[PDB]
Amino acid sequence: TRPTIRPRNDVVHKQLSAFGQYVAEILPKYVQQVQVSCFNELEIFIHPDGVIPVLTFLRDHTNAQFKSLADLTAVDVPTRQNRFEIVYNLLSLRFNSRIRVKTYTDELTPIESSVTVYKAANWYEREIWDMFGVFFANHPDLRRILTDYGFEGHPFRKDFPLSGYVELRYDDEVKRVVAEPVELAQEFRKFDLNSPWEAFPAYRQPPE
């Protein structure tokens, strides 16, 4: 148990649990769940309507002071009615701590832009819109950031194919670069790797 196993810090775990209870007490209108992982990371699950109040409180409160937006991204889980999960990663320099704020949305429901709260969010929101198709309300300038001009679809969605639908080549007759349906000399070969024997009993699901 000593040499090869990562050590666990109990003191940090206690502090993060207490701060999660604190935040949940102060904002009962939006907090749906508070969690602390066993490797010492704190998560806060909120209702989409509380994006702005929660982030503002965590930025401006004296006991919080998470003044930096470390990262903002999305995760797609097609089995859920609300397809998309929005994740905010915040870092506090005053208290040397990190926090994670989560919410959810689907294809047709916009999320409020967090640009007023954080200047850094402007590019991240653009990337979320480009890759997933999530619309952010009141964005200063929302448009594609990573994909080619006129690109159709959102490539980070699970349903989108890995190689896409079109390719590019140069055509001498029209003397320009043209787009055509993807054709592959060698098809990507799909592997089935998962073991039919369960690996982790601590995560077993009830048999429904």
Residues 163 to 202: which contact other proteins by CB under 8 A?
Answer: 163-165, 171, 173-191, 193-202
Q: Which of 10, 112, 132, 147 binds other proteins (CB under 8 A)?
A: 147
Number of residues that bind other proteins (CB under 8 A): 143
Please say whether the beta carbons of 166 and 141 come within 8 A.
no
Please say whether the beta carbons of 136 and 80 come within 8 A.
no
Which three-class secondary structure string do you get for 24-70? HHHCCCCEEEEEECCCCCEEEEECHHHHHHHHHHHHHCCCCCCCEEE
Q: How far is the CB of 21 from other proteins (least distance, A)?
A: 6
Name the residue type at position 193.
L
**Minimum CB distance to other proteins smaller for 113 or for 197:** 197
Residue 39 interacts with other proteins (CB under 8 A)? yes
Q: How far is the CB of 111 from other proteins (least distance, A)?
A: 11
Name the residue type at position 202.
A
Residue 159 interacts with other proteins (CB under 8 A)? yes
Sign of CA dihedral 136, 140, 141, 147: negative
Per CB under 8 A, which of residues 54..73 are in contact with other proteins? 56-57, 59-65, 67-71, 73
Q: How far is the CB of 207 from other proteins (least distance, A)?
A: 9
**Rounded to whole angstroms, how far apart are CA atoms 47 and 102?**
9
User: Strand 97-105 vs strand 111-112: parallel, antiparallel, or unpaired?
Assistant: unpaired
Q: How far is the CB of 113 from other proteins (least distance, A)?
A: 13
Residue 80 interacts with other proteins (CB under 8 A)? yes
Per CB under 8 A, which of residues 12..31 are in contact with other proteins? 12-13, 15-22, 24-31
* Three-class secondary structure of residue 168 per DSSP: strand
Q: How far is the CB of 90 from other proteins (least distance, A)?
A: 10
Residue 206 interacts with other proteins (CB under 8 A)? no
Residue 160, C-beta contacts closer than 8 angstroms, at least 6 positions apart = 153, 154
Per CB under 8 A, which of residues 99..138 are in contact with other proteins? 99-100, 102, 104, 107-110, 118-120, 122-123, 133, 135, 137
**Rounded to whole angstroms, how far apart are CA atoms 171 and 107?**
37
